[PDB]
Design a protein around this nucleic acid. Structure first.
Lengths: 130, 118, 184, 117, 182, 87
RNA sequence: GAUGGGGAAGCUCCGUUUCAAAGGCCUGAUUUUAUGCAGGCCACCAUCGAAAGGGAAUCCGGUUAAGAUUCCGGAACCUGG
RNA sequence: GUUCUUUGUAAAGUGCCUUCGAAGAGUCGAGUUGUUUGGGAAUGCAGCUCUAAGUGGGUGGUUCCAUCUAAAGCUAA
RNA sequence: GUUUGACCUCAAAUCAGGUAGGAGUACCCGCUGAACUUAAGCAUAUCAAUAAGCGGAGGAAAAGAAACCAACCGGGAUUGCCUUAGUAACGGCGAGUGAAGCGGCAAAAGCUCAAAUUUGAAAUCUGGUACCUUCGGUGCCCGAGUUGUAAUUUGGAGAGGG
């Protein structure tokens, strides 16, 4: 081409690049356990079969445990704010466990919290303080 | 014949076929590397086709209906994160298809393991 | 002789509106609350100016400062938002409604008085959207409405509603006839 | 002249050296026209160029420190990558996620799983 | 809200109130230039349902286009959108709506969004328009009027133009030849 | 060079008329005189009146161009505009 | 030939004062509910277009390898400050 | 993988009971002109006369029936 | 009040901060749009919904989550390839033109607004200024917005409560 001629007719130099090899050799990155067992020599389907995990959920077009246990094993292996705690302490001191009366406490139940919410918060506070 | 036009101006010989397969394989390998823990494709439902000339053949579907997901013991929003396709515009009519989809969802749930958020 | 194009255009618009016949749905304005009752309404509304940005900011900072060291009812205020005003209307929660007569898009306010009278909610037309704006910490709102009010001003609000009904609503109910813009 | 030497020397010294090198170049050119060749002309010209470049760099580094931290840097000192890169909203604007999408993602994060058991 | 009432009222364009409003606005616009900026939209509901917002960065423009055609094959709405986008080159056209018409000319209102404004850029709901792929959407018929004129739809009624008449014509009028001839 | 007009060099441009000075400064006479008093500027009389006043015999008041030009850079001018905007 | 406009999908065509907010001069003690500006006058409105059109001004003598109202000697005239 | 911050009567997800529950107009459509499509069942497009309804409306098939419900917008392979 | 300001509309700054032309163009999105050639010379027709010309973008573009296809045991975003099929169908039914459902496969991601009062507090944000853990964050200031900026949600419904 007209422009390609100049790139070769001038000493500017082509911005040479080489990445074809890396296009095929791709490093497994999403899991260290798989990386310790992955083998780039085998294909993705072959590697999945060797590891023990299904490569494809759908039927494969055309023709065709220790690692899982190690991966599976590792799979099996909140508080209250200062103002909220003070409000709950005030409620307990004033009405105690009398939820029926605490629900109507305008002085303390400013937001008119329901009986269930009040009892749940009081139980949380009691568990956090015995 | 059907050549009165300037057909010669548009003749794409599929020489890329040989390289297209390799490119697709490389893309699949890249997806596997990125999606290593999970399968390259989502769990698709089994469905029956219309057009009786083909209805006798059982084939896969796009995504499970909301009713199927509910009967499978999970929710559509949660099922998506597990790789189960959900179709909000598909309505189940045949009972056998619904039962097969429910069984497939149950098998998938039993066969899957989810990593902790840690 | 020549004047600015926009000045001539607006003068022509004025002299055309003064001379163009309009349906009763239009010209429902131009029969508005008198100066006396309008001033009384402004005085009543002047006591319920919504808290401005500076006032709310200083109040919140003062409250936070006290909280950092370690109950009152909802402040009654005028409601002015057109979407909020039209939502209080049709729900019977609105007690007094003020409508600006100088809204640029007439269609935005043509139906408001009709809806207010259909719902049986007192309504009044007052000249000047800026006047409503001046009392709402905004340039203009084109509408103003009242909600639950202090006990002290309840009697004043009732008297103002009665005066409005006697003066504007009942007197100008004939506005349906006499197509406006008929001046020679 | 050497660039690393001029960096430590104060600006007034570089300015004086510029005039000295200009005088030397003028004298050599006066001599050059009466001689078939004069190799030192190239060296003195490239030394004048180096001195000018050093002075420009000294001015630019001070100017950059003058606008340190503050916004609206001079256009000549801004990124020269390309016109399009000024568009294509930056990382902060590109990653800006609406509250709806952020809450939906938080409620339903994408999980990682395998299917064998 | 009042948006529903305005939408219902606007549908009765033949109404006396809207009749007088149009009879006044037709002269008001005719006295003005062919293209001029509008301080506020005359149909707030229509703009609001079209994605328009009152925040800084949105502009409402008024444009006039002649009527008639020995033939023409493009909508006046698309022509007005192109003629307004060819002036506010720094503004991105999103959509437009009819506000009035005349025997000799038609009047349309077009909402413009500036991708350079930081408020639009910082808004996740509108920053998508800042992408260069959306440049001059009106010139490519990517707006509602442009898509309608192009025939982009689904079903048998739009097979010839489901994905563009030119694209489908080029794709179908090609003699595919694989390595192993069929 | 081409012909040079008489009232374009010398006293013609050395001194600026008070009316012209006010127009150039774009400042009201009140603020202009306030700034002049603050800076202690005074009018001056050239040896020839008509020459300075574009060849016109009028009771014009003349001010030094350099002093007026220096005045324009005073922050007090911006402070006056700020006060006007605040008012 | 822009300028303010109109037609044209458009590369663009019309139009030179066309119903444009199209600038250029002066005065005052500092403008009185107190130091934020008042008043007086004219209504045209870019540019290019001529080395044969109008124009501010140099005459003589001598000099060179090629230049002279220019280079050297003498004496001249126009514009501005 | 290591570490700082959370916190706030803050922000979410599912089941049950209870009270409500919102549908984009000069737009669909009709008659006509010109063009295009295999698209006669007038395929769509642009102009022109008129103009629409909300247990309402488009398209098709046995006396009704099936699907969406447009006239706003974004999106990787 | 023979006054002052609110507004609403419209102007100006070599104003602070910004953006637009143009080039390239195989592919993409539109506008515009002929003829040579061919059939019973050429009236419909083919060349052609092409070349030329014009405007608008990227590395891909467009389209894309149904006012879709089907009539069945229903399919279930868009795109691309094989088949469908040189078939249905058009064609002064003469030359020629010519799809689409479904089926086989490469890939999959769905969504966001309008319309519901935050009304017990426009809770939103552009811009200037002083700092910093400077693709931005904090305090202060001015302004935009009530002719609507914050939050939830939209046919898979959804929302206020226990």
């Amino acid at each position: 081409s007209v422009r390609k001629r100049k790139m070769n007719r001038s000493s500017v130099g082509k911005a040479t690049r080489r990445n074809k090899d890396k296009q095929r050799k791709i490093n497994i990155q999403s899991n260290p356990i798989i990386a310790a067992n992955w083998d780039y020599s085998l294909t993705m389907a072959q590697n999945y079969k060797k590891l023990g995990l299904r490569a494809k959920l759908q039927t494969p077009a055309g023709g065709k445990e220790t690692e899982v246990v190690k991966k599976l094993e590792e799979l099996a292996s909140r508080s209250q704010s200062e103002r909220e705690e003070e409000w709950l302490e005030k409620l307990y001191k004033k009405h105690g466990d009398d939820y029926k009366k605490m629900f109507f406490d305008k002085k303390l139940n400013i937001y008119q919290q329901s009986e269930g919410d009040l009892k749940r918060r009081l139980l949380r506070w009691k568990k956090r303080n015995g | 014949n059907h050549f009165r036009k300037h057909w010669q101006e548009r003749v794409k010989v599929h020489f890329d076929q040989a390289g297209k397969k390799v490119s697709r394989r490389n893309a699949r390998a890249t997806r596997a590397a990125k999606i290593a823990p999970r399968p390259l494709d989502l769990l698709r439902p089994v469905v029956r086709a219309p057009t009786v000339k083909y209805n006798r053949k059982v084939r896969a579907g796009r995504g499970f209906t909301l009713a199927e997901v509910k009967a499978a013991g999970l929710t559509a929003a949660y099922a998506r994160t597990i790789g189960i396709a959900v179709d909000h515009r598909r309505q189940n009519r045949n009972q056998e298809i619904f039962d097969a989809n429910v069984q497939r969802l149950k098998e998938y749930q039993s066969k899957i393991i989810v990593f902790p958020r840690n | 002789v020549k004047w600015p194009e926009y000045v001539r255009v607006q003068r022509q618009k004025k002299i055309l509106s003064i001379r163009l016949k309009v349906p009763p749905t239009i010209a429902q304005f131009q029969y508005t609350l008198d100066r006396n009752t309008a001033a009384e309404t402004f005085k009543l509304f002047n006591k319920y100016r919504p808290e401005t940005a500076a006032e709310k900011k200083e109040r919140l900072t003062k409250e936070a400062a006290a909280v950092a060291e370690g109950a009152s009812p909802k402040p009654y205020a005028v409601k002015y938002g057109l979407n909020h005003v039209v939502a209080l209307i049709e729900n019977k929660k609105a007690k007094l409604v003020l409508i600006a007569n100088d809204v640029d898009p007439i269609e935005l306010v043509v139906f408001l008085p009709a809806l207010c009278k259909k719902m049986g909610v007192p309504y009044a037309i007052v000249k000047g959207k800026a006047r409503l704006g001046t009392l709402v910490n905004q340039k203009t709102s084109a509408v103003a409405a009242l909600t639950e009010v202090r006990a002290e001003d309840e009697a004043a609000l009732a008297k103002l509603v009665s005066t409005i009904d006697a003066n504007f609503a009942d007197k100008y109910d004939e506005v349906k006839k006499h197509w406006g813009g008929g001046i020679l | 002249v050497k660039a690393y030497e001029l960096r430590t020397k104060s600006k007034e010294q570089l300015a004086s050296q510029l005039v000295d090198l200009k005088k030397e170049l003028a004298e050599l050119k006066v001599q050059k026209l009466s001689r078939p060749s004069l190799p030192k002309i190239k060296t003195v010209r490239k030394s004048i160029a180096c001195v000018l470049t050093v002075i420009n760099e000294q001015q630019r580094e001070a100017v950059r420190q003058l606008y340190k931290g503050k916004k609206y840097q001079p256009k000549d000192l801004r990124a020269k990558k390309t016109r399009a890169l000024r568009r294509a909203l930056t990382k902060f604007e590109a990653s800006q996620v609406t509250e709806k999408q952020r809450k939906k993602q938080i409620a339903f994060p994408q999980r990682k799983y395998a299917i064998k058991a | 809200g009042a948006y529903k009432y305005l939408e219902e009222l606007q549908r009765k364009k033949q109404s006396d109130v809207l009749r007088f409003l149009q009879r006044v606005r037709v002269w008001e616009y005719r006295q003005k230039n062919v293209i001029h900026r509008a301080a506020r939209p005359t149909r707030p509901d229509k703009a609001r349902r079209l994605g328009y917002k009152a925040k800084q960065g949105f502009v409402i423009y008024r444009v006039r286009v002649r009527r008639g055609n020995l033939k023409y094959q493009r909508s006046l709405r698309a022509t007005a959108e192109e003629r307004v986008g060819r002036r506010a080159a720094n503004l991105r056209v999103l959509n437009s709506y009819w506000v009035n018409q005349d025997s000799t000319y038609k009047y349309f209102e077009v909402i413009l969004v500036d991708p350079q404004h930081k408020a639009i850029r910082r808004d996740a709901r509108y920053n998508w328009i800042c992408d260069p792929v959306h440049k001059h959407r009106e010139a490519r018929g990517l707006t509602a009027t442009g898509k309608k004129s192009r025939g982009i739809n689904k079903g048998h009624k739009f097979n010839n133009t489901k994905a563009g008449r030119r694209k489908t014509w080029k794709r179908q009028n090609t003699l595919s030849l694989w390595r192993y001839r069929k | 060079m081409r012909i040079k007009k008489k009232n374009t060099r010398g006293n013609a441009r050395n001194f600026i008329t008070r009316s012209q000075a006010v127009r150039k400064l774009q400042v009201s006479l009140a603020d202009f005189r306030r700034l002049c008093i603050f800076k202690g500027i005074y009018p001056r009389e050239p040896r020839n009146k008509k020459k300075a006043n574009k060849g016109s015999t009028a009771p014009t008041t003349f001010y030094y161009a350099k002093d007026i030009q220096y005045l324009m850079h005073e922050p007090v001018l911006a402070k006056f505009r700020e006060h006007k905007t605040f008012a």
